[PDB]
Structures are given as C-alpha cells and as structure tokens.
Amino acid sequence: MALIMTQQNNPLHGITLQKLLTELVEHYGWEELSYMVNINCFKKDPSIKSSLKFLRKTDWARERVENIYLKLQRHKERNQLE
C-alpha cells in the first residue's frame, strides 16, 4: 500500500508481539535479531510462526525483541506535536 496514512490518528498506538517481530524481520532481518539476542533461534529455521512460539516460552527473549523494536523507534520518524 503506497497510500500512506496521513491521519493524526495513531494506527500503531498498540502493537502486538506477532506484528512487532514481523516488522523487525522486515526492517532489520534474522541476522541483527540473532546477534542482539544471544540465542540460536532466529538463525535456526528462519520462521515467523516458530520464532513467535519460542518467544512465548522463552519470555526474556520476547522482552529483548520488544527492546529491539524500541531501537527502531528511536531511529524511526518520531511523530511531532498535535
């Protein structure tokens, strides 16, 4: 969708883990994720659905993934005032 959402509304004001990790694979990739999170998962059978389930069981890894998305946010276009 080239049509960008030019609205003052925030359609990303509450992103879930599933969507979050997917965007990390889209904007970074499995390599960066596997390097920042010291585990053999993103470098083992690169699968979104599998990685999600792994983050559910290995909770601390999930918390790392969220922090990785925050790394993206502090480099991404910061929404200005109202």
Curated annotation (Swiss-Prot):
InterPro entries: DNA-binding_VF530-like, SAP_dom_sf. Keywords: DNA-binding. GO terms for molecular function: double-stranded DNA binding. The keyword Membrane does not apply. Coiled coil: none annotated. It comes from the Bacteria. The keyword DNA-binding applies. Gene3D superfamilies: SAP domain. Pfam families: VF530. Binds double-stranded DNA (dsDNA). Monomer. This is DNA-binding protein VF_0530. It comes from Aliivibrio fischeri (strain ATCC 700601 / ES114).
